[PDB]
Design a binder for this molecule. Sequence first.
Ligand SMILES: NC(=O)[C@H]1CCCN(C(=O)Cc2cccnc2N)C1
Ligand SMILES: [Zn+2]
Length: 139
Amino acid sequence: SGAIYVGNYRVVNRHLATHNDWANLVWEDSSRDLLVSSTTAQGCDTIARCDCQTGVYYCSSRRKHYPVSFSKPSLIFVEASEYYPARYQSHLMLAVGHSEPGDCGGILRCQHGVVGIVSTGGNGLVGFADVRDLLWLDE
Ligand SMILES: NC(=O)[C@H]1CCCN(C(=O)Cc2cccnc2N)C1
Ligand SMILES: [Zn+2]
């Protein structure tokens, strides 16, 4: 679990969005596993606007943060799950690191701010849904 709170927006994994997220929907994209909902309270997370390929993510299944080198956002095949059929997930970045299904939503950050959230994993890999191209989150 986990979310990004920026301005009047909450960014979550689309497969973990709640009834309240869907009732306050702003934008969603199944191909990216992202959903953004509106909030009444002001969020103060900062979104990175950069091309960093190193950062630190929070891993809930270890209660720890890990440093990672990750690939640029790209179209990556993701095997079928209870939430989606087998498909290409877009804007996904992979890195070597520990992840379990419940780790989805953990934030990846670089020195500029939030980069994205955990969305995929298994086999000593961890995948992050990029949010740096969503310029409207702060303007
Ligand atoms: N974005 C998606 O389609 C995901 C939806 C939930 C299931 N998916 C995983 O990759 C889970 C996973 C397995 C093993 C280790 N870590 C994990 N995060 C795919
Ligand atoms: Zn950066």
